[PDB]
Design a protein around this ligand. Structure first.
Ligand SMILES: Cc1cc2nc3c(=O)[nH]c(=O)nc-3n(C[C@H](O)[C@H](O)[C@H](O)COP(=O)(O)OP(=O)(O)OC[C@H]3O[C@@H](n4cnc5c(N)ncnc54)[C@H](O)[C@@H]3O)c2cc1C
Ligand SMILES: Cc1cc2nc3c(=O)[nH]c(=O)nc-3n(C[C@H](O)[C@H](O)[C@H](O)COP(=O)(O)OP(=O)(O)OC[C@H]3O[C@@H](n4cnc5c(N)ncnc54)[C@H](O)[C@@H]3O)c2cc1C
Ligand SMILES: NC(=O)c1ccc[n+]([C@@H]2O[C@H](COP(=O)([O-])OP(=O)(O)OC[C@H]3O[C@@H](n4cnc5c(N)ncnc54)[C@H](OP(=O)(O)O)[C@@H]3O)[C@@H](O)[C@H]2O)c1
Ligand SMILES: NC(=O)c1ccc[n+]([C@@H]2O[C@H](COP(=O)([O-])OP(=O)(O)OC[C@H]3O[C@@H](n4cnc5c(N)ncnc54)[C@H](OP(=O)(O)O)[C@@H]3O)[C@@H](O)[C@H]2O)c1
Lengths: 316, 316
């Protein structure tokens, strides 16, 4: 087994990992980046992106990530295709174990993301990128003045429904239970939009099937109530499955301070804002952000992490 | 005199203001953006940009900003060419007075930047974008393994010198006084690089002239010492004038909490991170960031500000 030492190691090949790589390479730090299993991150699972600033037309998630990969390799970032399964952050240098070897480093940037879960239905899988989506902030504007459905019961779903009711003609919130398990302020605003507006509630329903045509989604079939099998049918142009994200942080449990699985950073306006609870370990992207979750905020913290890492490595 | 009300008003047409505009427009908020006098921000004063992620080749600051302008107008952002001279943020709606009218709004995003100062020399003005620069993080990699000069005595200059000594073969720090007025940790690391390395000190000198050829800077002439007129000459490929930035916040004094002229935001990992001391007023870009100062971090906080503004406007 091999053991490669690097001054700076970056975990993840999403927008945060690639931006941290171009900033680290241009700081002459010679970064090594480990891609993980999903080479290019969550953006490779989507079709059109029209909120990456400065790219008004013709951008897709795959094309953005190919450009970011080109950018990192232009400045000679060593890119390694591997995935980390064990970590030891309590001894110096930090040791990380992959499938293809052992890695040690003096500074670490963690940009392992927070992947969206789906329902697992074949009909849902069929319409991904053509009507079924997992990000309302990104894709909500394509369904402006149209009917939309959101499925879920926690915080994300009530937030997605609330955000979407300002864009769509109406929002259909679908949930298995007869009650939402979201924050008190979210549920208050939800019930105001149910009563005086835009959101139609469909509690005690489960999604059976996503129907549609050649261009995409046209409807949704629901079933059940509290004791019965009624089977509803909704005419809808888009579906937003909002059942939660999975921050890829299991490997860091007991090593780093986490908050609902998200890596806690120092934050603040006085620098060293991406530093985790361990000196020399920094986090960027969706793994440390459960509020905004965009490629542009992930690239922004990717940049901050590389400059924090540079300042750490130089004794400041 | 006219008084135009807008639900959301954005101040500034740099990367933070334009990204907040595309996120606000795609949230169906119908943003109005006031450009200020410098239409396109600080990036219009630079030549090549090769740290905007996903753009490996052929980007210049003017081209990025033209693309961001196209992006904002594609989503029907109302762009107004005006500059704000007076503000009243203590009454609702917020009132802002420009040269071309009065504006009121329910939520405000301030993205007015922090402009770099220069020495005012004709020879320096002659070589801007071709050897004279004000951002070491951005432009430092172009002078890799070459001789570089930095001029200044505060925090920025010692930081720029320290950052540049890892890229350049040697750094020549030029200062009027016989001592630097930077942080204790910065001066410690500085004196270590002076003694065991890369940084050559030139205290009690003032820059007289920046010389160069058709392609750019080739030298620098200094003069004086503590009582005498010796006149030095340095062979150098780049000059970094690091004499300070000017956050455009005079209009907000006594209205908002400032910290060395920078707008203080809430920050943190629990949302509403761009909110200033006044509810409903948010800040983004270099006006609230004195540490990273990049177009990508400005676009990231621009995005955060628009989503914070959306959540505020919807009672969350
Ligand atoms: C359906 C959908 C559409 C979206 N559309 C948009 C859009 O239009 N615009 C937008 O702004 N945002 C969009 N987003 C959000 C965007 O995808 C994420 O914000 C962004 O990808 C997060 O960047 P990241 O670098 O933090 O993580 P990710 O892109 O999630 O990348 C994480 C990386 O870490 C690696 N990794 C994980 N575990 C390990 C490990 N143990 N060892 C090593 N590497 C590991 C992975 O392989 C991957 O490369 C969308 C999201 C979804 C799900
Ligand atoms: C020489 C140089 C080169 C640089 N190169 C790079 C680079 O290669 N890459 C990089 O990442 N960064 C670079 N930067 C840094 C980058 O320019 C800034 O980080 C970025 O422009 C800040 O964005 P912003 O939107 O916060 O503010 P700015 O771009 O500074 O824009 C501020 C806006 O606010 C407006 N405004 C000001 N006052 C008022 C008012 N009272 N009313 C209304 N509007 C007002 C202005 O007109 C302007 O449109 C460089 C900076 C300099 C100086
Ligand atoms: N603090 C905040 O403001 C905030 C905001 C956004 C995100 N976050 C973070 O992001 C994480 C994930 O967001 P979340 O809370 O929405 O995820 P979550 O905690 O998993 O809640 C989503 C819920 O959707 C329901 N569901 C699952 N499968 C379903 C199906 N087939 N049909 C219908 N309903 C189904 C489940 O609730 P039931 O068991 O009730 O059915 C599930 O728990 C959070 O845990 C948090 O860390 C926090
Ligand atoms: N907290 C931090 O870590 C940090 C870091 C970066 C930036 N910042 C922020 O950014 C602001 C600006 O940075 P700064 O401190 O460098 O600016 P500054 O406070 O203006 O200091 C720069 C100094 O350069 C000197 N100078 C001016 N003209 C010169 C010339 N012609 N030749 C040589 N020297 C000349 C002056 O010092 P003399 O009077 O001594 O000659 C001047 O005060 C700060 O005030 C702060 O708000 C803070």
């Amino acid at each position: 087994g091999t053991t490669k030492h690097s001054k700076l190691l970056i975990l993840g090949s999403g927008p945060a990992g690639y931006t941290a790589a171009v900033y680290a390479a241009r700081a002459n730090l010679q970064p090594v980046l480990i891609t993980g299993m999903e080479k290019g991150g969550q953006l490779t699972t989507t079709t059109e992106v029209e909120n990456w600033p400065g790219d008004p037309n013709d951008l897709t998630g795959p094309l953005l990530m190919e450009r970011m990969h080109e950018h990192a390799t232009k400045f000679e970032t060593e890119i390694i295709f591997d995935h980390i399964n064990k970590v030891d952050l309590q001894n110096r240098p930090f040791r990380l174990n992959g499938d293809n070897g052992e890695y040690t480093c003096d500074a670490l940037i963690i940009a392992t993301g927070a992947s969206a879960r789906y329902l697992g239905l074949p009909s849902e899988e069929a319409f991904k990128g053509r009507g079924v989506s997992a990000c309302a902030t990104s894709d909500g504007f394509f369904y402006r003045n149209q009917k939309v459905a959101v499925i879920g019961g926690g915080n994300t779903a009530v937030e997605e429904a609330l955000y979407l009711s300002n864009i769509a003609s109406e929002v259909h919130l679908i949930h298995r239970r007869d009650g939402f398990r979201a924050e008190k302020i979210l549920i208050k605003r939800l019930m105001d939009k149910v009563e005086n507006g835009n959101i139609i509630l469909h509690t005690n329903r489960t999604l059976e099937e996503v129907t549609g045509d050649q261009m995409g989604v046209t409807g949704v079939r629901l079933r059940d109530t509290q004791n019965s099998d009624n089977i509803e049918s909704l005419d809808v142009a888009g579906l937003f499955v909002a059942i939660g994200h999975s921050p890829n942080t299991a490997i860091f449990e007991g090593q780093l301070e986490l908050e609902n699985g998200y890596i806690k950073v120092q934050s603040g306006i006085h620098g060293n804002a991406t530093q985790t609870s361990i000196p020399g370990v920094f986090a960027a992207g969706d793994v440390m952000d459960h509020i905004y979750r965009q490629a542009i905020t992930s690239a922004g913290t990717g940049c901050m992490a590389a400059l924090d890492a540079e300042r750490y490595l130089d004794g400041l």
